[PDB]
Design an enzyme around this catalytic site. Sequence first.
Site, short mmCIF file in Angstrom:
data_model
loop_
_atom_site.label_atom_id
_atom_site.label_comp_id
_atom_site.label_asym_id
_atom_site.label_seq_id
_atom_site.Cartn_x
_atom_site.Cartn_y
_atom_site.Cartn_z
N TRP A 121 -140.99 30.58 -82.54
CA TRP A 121 -140.37 30.04 -81.69
C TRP A 121 -140.41 30.70 -80.40
O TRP A 121 -140.29 31.86 -80.19
CB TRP A 121 -138.82 29.97 -81.77
CG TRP A 121 -137.57 29.17 -81.24
CD1 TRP A 121 -137.91 28.16 -80.95
CD2 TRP A 121 -136.60 29.75 -80.66
NE1 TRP A 121 -136.74 27.30 -80.34
CE2 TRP A 121 -135.91 28.56 -80.03
CE3 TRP A 121 -135.94 31.07 -80.45
CZ2 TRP A 121 -134.73 28.56 -79.53
CZ3 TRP A 121 -134.47 31.04 -79.71
CH2 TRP A 121 -134.14 29.81 -79.31
N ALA A 204 -131.47 29.91 -88.21
CA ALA A 204 -130.85 28.82 -87.41
C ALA A 204 -130.79 27.38 -88.08
O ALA A 204 -130.17 26.63 -87.50
CB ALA A 204 -131.86 28.83 -85.96
N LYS A 237 -127.12 23.84 -85.21
CA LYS A 237 -127.59 22.81 -85.95
C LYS A 237 -126.87 22.51 -87.22
O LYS A 237 -126.43 21.25 -87.32
CB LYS A 237 -129.18 22.93 -86.12
CG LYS A 237 -130.00 23.04 -85.06
CD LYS A 237 -130.27 24.44 -84.43
CE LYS A 237 -131.42 24.48 -83.45
NZ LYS A 237 -132.23 25.65 -83.37
C1 LIG Z 1 -131.83 26.64 -82.42
C2 LIG Z 1 -132.63 27.87 -82.78
C3 LIG Z 1 -132.01 29.20 -82.25
C4 LIG Z 1 -130.63 29.23 -81.51
O1 LIG Z 1 -130.26 28.24 -81.03
P1 LIG Z 1 -128.81 28.40 -80.18
O2 LIG Z 1 -128.82 26.95 -79.54
O3 LIG Z 1 -128.93 29.40 -79.32
O4 LIG Z 1 -127.52 28.34 -81.23
C5 LIG Z 1 -132.79 30.37 -82.49
N1 LIG Z 1 -134.02 30.18 -83.15
C6 LIG Z 1 -134.46 29.07 -83.44
C7 LIG Z 1 -135.80 29.21 -84.48
C8 LIG Z 1 -134.04 28.08 -83.45
O5 LIG Z 1 -134.44 26.79 -83.91
#
Ligand SMILES: *Cc1c(COP(=O)(O)O)cnc(C)c1O
Lengths: 388, 394
Positions: A121, A204, A237
Amino acid sequence: MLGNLKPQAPDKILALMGEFGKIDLGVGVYKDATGHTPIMRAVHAAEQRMLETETTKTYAGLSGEPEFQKAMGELILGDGLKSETTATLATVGGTGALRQALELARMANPDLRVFVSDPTWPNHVSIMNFMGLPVQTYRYFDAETRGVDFEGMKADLAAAKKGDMVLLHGCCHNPTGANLTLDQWAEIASILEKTGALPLIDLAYQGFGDGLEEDAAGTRLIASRIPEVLIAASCSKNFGIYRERTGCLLALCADAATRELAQGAMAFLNRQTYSFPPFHGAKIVSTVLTTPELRADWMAELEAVRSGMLRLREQLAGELRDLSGSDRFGFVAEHRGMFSRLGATPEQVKRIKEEFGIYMVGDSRINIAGLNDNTIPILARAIIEVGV
Amino acid sequence: MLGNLKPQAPDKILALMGEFRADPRQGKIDLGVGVYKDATGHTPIMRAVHAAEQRMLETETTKTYAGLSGEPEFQKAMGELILGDGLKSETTATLATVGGTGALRQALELARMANPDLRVFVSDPTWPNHVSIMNFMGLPVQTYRYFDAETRGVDFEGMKADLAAAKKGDMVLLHGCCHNPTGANLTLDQWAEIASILEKTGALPLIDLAYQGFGDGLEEDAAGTRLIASRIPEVLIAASCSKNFGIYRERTGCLLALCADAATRELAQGAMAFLNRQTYSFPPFHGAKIVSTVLTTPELRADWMAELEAVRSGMLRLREQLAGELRDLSGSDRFGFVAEHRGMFSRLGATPEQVKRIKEEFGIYMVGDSRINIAGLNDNTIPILARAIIEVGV
Ligand SMILES: *Cc1c(COP(=O)(O)O)cnc(C)c1O
Ligand SMILES: *Cc1c(COP(=O)(O)O)cnc(C)c1O
């Protein structure tokens, strides 16, 4: 003063929202048959119940509410939750949990380095860069087989030193969709224990992979072996409360003493950043989790979502198969999570977006939840047109 | 590795309530509370707020990611609530934050990005959290005289003498209104002079605005901020919706960056969105939405302003009562400052020793610096507080 501010680079994934028969396959949010990100039934009921029961909005807990801290611990670690040696901190979403995680570790080790997957990410590297933390990468995505280069991964990880932090995705690896099996997880645990590297798990998507309990399997195995581990969880999510900004950081320690140490630093960390953490989202989550009727329906809806997307992958792969007579795109059905990298080059993906109107992330990362029976063949044809 | 962590001190607020609860005295009083409490000792949910939450429950159809810097309705409604008709959007940047504290943290981070050698000037005394955040960031902190321990008023002469030392690029933190913890405040004329000092020094004003509507009124409390906003080209404002909206736990606030021109505004706005993104991505939606709903919906807004005014007047009555009681018992107008102070807090000016004696002899608790919460007083507690003060020799 302010005139001396240097321009900053935007979020390319979020930029797609601006760049949008258009087909939205970018930002990682779940979408239904009609392209809507609904509010889950249990969440709505939770809010209604909260509207009646809450009598005050005074300052609550700096580390979050005990009900949330507890509920979250059991959700992630199950019966492997040794509260006596676990510290919990309610944060502003999963992202806040990560930032808070990096700050905590840096406090205990100024000379820490972070190992991230190739690829990972982007926001991971963004934050680390901001903090000025040295980032190293380990092989992960096998570009050829669209799977995991486990041999490469084990090789690079073996080079980590004691005090180093290794960032692992608990499941549903963003952006690839390629995930480790429990056997591979056991081996990784062997390496970590030997290297003395602190595991940081970014969880996540618990629930979108193979099920609530199955997706937490890997995290549980690490927690059972490694005496000290950090876990950054997101409720955005799996609860569909993206805008509420709710998640939490779990600090697994070797003993109560250290637990009290870590918990202290975690609370202090919130205080110095924004004081208390937002209450609304954390409340919805605990209400759902602690109310049997609410939990039962939530698990069900998440299951339907997860099983439905599973169906979509199979369709997409099949469509492409019938459109090529080759098991090349088989990786689509193997991948698990919300995303999947098609392997298309930057030139190809750009052609697709401008002419076909289908917007996917530059590295060919597609949100399968953006597809449906109507759009699947169109995507299949669109990518078949050029390369792939 | 985590064993190498430094023991971080508790929030202290808990320790205060710790001793209080342990007190076996049936008539103990708690004037150390930092939030507002009604006649029945509760922190109610404002009517308008409960109305906004009902409408949001019926109209919201999704909870997908929204504005990175916050939603437009909130940003505009807030800028209007603070800057009134003087809101020049073309040169104003806005950032929804996690409460006022988040707004403060971001302001400091922003300034430090623009000027690495930033130096901050804070009042003597000020909200402890100011110093803690700055110390944590490693920023050099300076102090300027503010509270006069003898008159319990503002030491303006001293304030001016110290602020004069500020250099081009330094930051000066001012409480827009209702000075926490003192309760002593600057008059519009004193604000005009402070404006001239800042103009001369070229220092950047950072206004902490958490109690708009608790002093003399919504417009009156913004008065000082508005004078600064109109005379100084660059100003940072950190507003809080916790107290005046009664949504403490929701964590709603915003950072306003007033710039000299649009080019700079665009530079600042981007830098702010980046700051939010590098900390927690998106700011909390719920509380901000309640706020934008109340302010935009004429009916709710009207009921909000009405409720806040009731709260404001009530406290003012308490101040007059206590000051009156103190006048009769003392046979002097030595405690008149109590009626002159604005906000829910007031620093009596008692020594830590007198404070301790007050607790042990009268079961009346308060912060160690002699700061009391006016809201914690009522017709039954005032006579007691009045007598305690005088008997201990304050
Ligand atoms: C969604 C996600 C997060 C955190 O999302 P928040 O909107 O800050 O809750 C962190 N890492 C990954 C890989 C994600 O897909
Ligand atoms: C209350 C207060 C704040 C803001 O509080 P938040 O709870 O973070 O909204 C900031 N500064 C002062 C002086 C305050 O009294």
